[PDB]
Amino acid sequence: MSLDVHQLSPNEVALMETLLATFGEAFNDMETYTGNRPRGAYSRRLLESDYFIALAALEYGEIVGGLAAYELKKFEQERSEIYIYDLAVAKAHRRRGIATALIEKLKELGAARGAYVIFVQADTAIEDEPAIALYSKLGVREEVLHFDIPVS
Amino acid sequence: SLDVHQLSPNEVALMETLLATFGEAFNDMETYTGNRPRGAYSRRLLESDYFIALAALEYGEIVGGLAAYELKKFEQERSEIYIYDLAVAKAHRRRGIATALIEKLKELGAARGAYVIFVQADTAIEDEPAIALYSKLGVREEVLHFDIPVS
């Protein structure tokens, strides 16, 4: 395997755009991830922010997977946690340890940031158990309730 | 009536009071207050533009509180507000306070381009008021939560 797990820099908005296409195909929601892409300026400032983390997995120059996460600096104590928002690997490239490699990279990035934990919500439907099997091996599962409150 | 407003960088002595309010709603007056950050640290956090701290007052004192994070999305120029903790003092429970905190967050989320506010709710019997409050302002979905150690 020639896998390269790479943290996107502010100098790599172009890579972020391709990663969005990887997310779209993997989530079967191309319209959401590529239908109204941000401007380079917006994407750039996000990449040079203190809390946003974008990882890309590459094979011979091709993006085959990636991860988007947010570092949450806490208020009750001097500590931080990393929230994995999106994580995806291209279909032809799955069951090969790419997602594991991405999370392993996020761990060593987290330890360098002083974060004490990484957490991620797993959807529960039929499409999910590959991710659930992935998350169950790395962390501790707990069943919670999620609510989407609308904003006008 | 009620007074819900956002905390400011030079309201750290009030944030630290809100930290205590969390400690009694949650019954863990040691995680939220047994190891509080430096005075220096907490203003840095309040001066940040993605962290949102809300305190509900009635008569010049804390009854409710909210701590949230604005998540600027990468796929589109939009934002999502993640409520991390929402708490109301027990003495003043069931008076529409938690509702007023979320309504305030809606108005500020709109001024940030936020299209949704999401919040997690566990399942323990003590948390049925939260689940009830949340189930009427948003549609529920049952998900799995995973805590992965950085170790």
Ligand SMILES: CC(C)(COP(=O)(O)OP(=O)(O)OC[C@H]1O[C@@H](n2cnc3c(N)ncnc32)[C@H](O)[C@@H]1OP(=O)(O)O)[C@@H](O)C(=O)NCCC(=O)NCCS
């Ligand atoms: C979930 C996903 C990222 C996993 O990618 P991946 O690179 O294939 O995962 P890995 O190869 O590292 O697999 C790691 C372990 O997780 C388990 N696992 C992964 N996929 C599995 C599957 N379909 N079925 C059962 N177990 C699975 C296995 O234990 C695997 O280890 P193993 O091959 O040694 O048995 C990929 O399936 C995907 O992109 N799905 C679509 C989007 C999605 O669900 N994202 C999650 C958002 S949180």
Ligand SMILES: CC(C)(COP(=O)(O)OP(=O)(O)OC[C@H]1O[C@@H](n2cnc3c(N)ncnc32)[C@H](O)[C@@H]1OP(=O)(O)O)[C@@H](O)C(=O)NCCC(=O)NCCS
């Ligand atoms: C959940 C909590 C914040 C609600 O606070 P609140 O100010 O009392 O709630 P509100 O007054 O605004 O209630 C609004 C609606 O929510 C529902 N609700 C609130 N509490 C309820 C309860 N014990 N039982 C049933 N429904 C309840 C009702 O529909 C209520 O409207 P109503 O009184 O007119 O019938 C509060 O109970 C609390 O702090 N609990 C402890 C901590 C917690 O669970 N936090 C959430 C996770 S961070």
